[PDB]
Amino acid sequence: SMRIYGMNGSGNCWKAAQILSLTGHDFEWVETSSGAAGTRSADFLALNAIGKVPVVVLDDGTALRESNAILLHFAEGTPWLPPPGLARTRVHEWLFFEQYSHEPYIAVARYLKSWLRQAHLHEARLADCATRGAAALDVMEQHLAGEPWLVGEGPTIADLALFAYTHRAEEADFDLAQWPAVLAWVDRVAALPGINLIPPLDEILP
């Protein structure tokens, strides 16, 4: 039976659970810690040498890693992933934008401020995050002011990939009211059948 190794509250892990649920796959969740008892354990590194969650393990033992690769793997042949061509390429562009220009600022600031509550250890990092995260939101705003979805005329895994952390941007100290087209898109994605939100970290973390 299929397993997701993940951390409760993680947007990257949410991507994996969300696409599995959207595409009709049953799975077992395995709560995995950070460090020698989890992501840096012998057993885990045997699944993923990179030492990161999410990892999805198929009933045949195959271990899949990288949240955006997991989105691509399970969305293949569904309306969540266009076929090769311009639309698929536009999806790819947003997924690499997400990993390079968005996640490292939004997800990280949320982690440091609302998960660890270590704002004080990362003043420099956090100011940079605030600036570069705002720039990533500006890119999303510019696009979503003119089209309601990231690609083509309907939702795709590009929307899922950027929704993962953007829907919880308040925990990274971003006020989405200042990016009204992004806010409207967050609401549009949240209203889609089958989409679930990450509850507030304060309510799910020990």
Ligand X SMILES: N[C@@H](CCC(=O)N[C@@H](CS)C(=O)NCC(=O)O)C(=O)O
Binding site for glutathione, by residue number, is: 10, 12, 34, 39-40, 53, 67, 99
Best CA proximity match to 174, nearest among 129, 124, 112: 129
CA 11 to mean position of chain CA atoms: 4
| CB neighbour list of residue 96: distance below 8 Å, 6 or more residues apart | none
| CB nearer ligand X, residue 7 or residue 181 | 7
φ, ψ for residue 63, nearest 5 deg? -105, 120
For residue 108, the minimal CB distance to ligand X (Å) is: 9
Of positions 28, 34, 45, 187, contacts ligand X by CB under 6 A: 34
Examine residue 104 and tell whether it contacts ligand X (CB under 6 A): no
Q: Which helix (H) or strand (E) holds 4?
A: strand 3-6
Burial class (CB in 10 A: 0-12, 13-18, 19+), 140: buried
Q: Binding partner of residue 155 among a second copy, ligand X, none, CB under 5 to 8 Å per kind?
A: none
Of positions 33, 78, 118, 142, contacts a second copy by CB under 8 A: 142
Q: Binding partner of residue 162 among a second copy, ligand X, none, CB under 5 to 8 Å per kind?
A: none
Segment interacting with ligand X, rule: CB under 6 A, options 66-74, 85-93, 119-127, 185-193 = 66-74
For residue 138, the minimal CB distance to ligand X (Å) is: 13
Task: Name the token pair of 72.
Answer: 């691509």
Binding mask 67-106 for a second copy (x = CB under 8 A): xxx--xx--xx------x-x-xx--xx-xxx-xxx-xx--
Q: Which helix (H) or strand (E) holds 57?
A: strand 55-57
For residue 16, the minimal CB distance to ligand X (Å) is: 8
Helix (H, G, I), strand (E, B) or coil at 198: coil
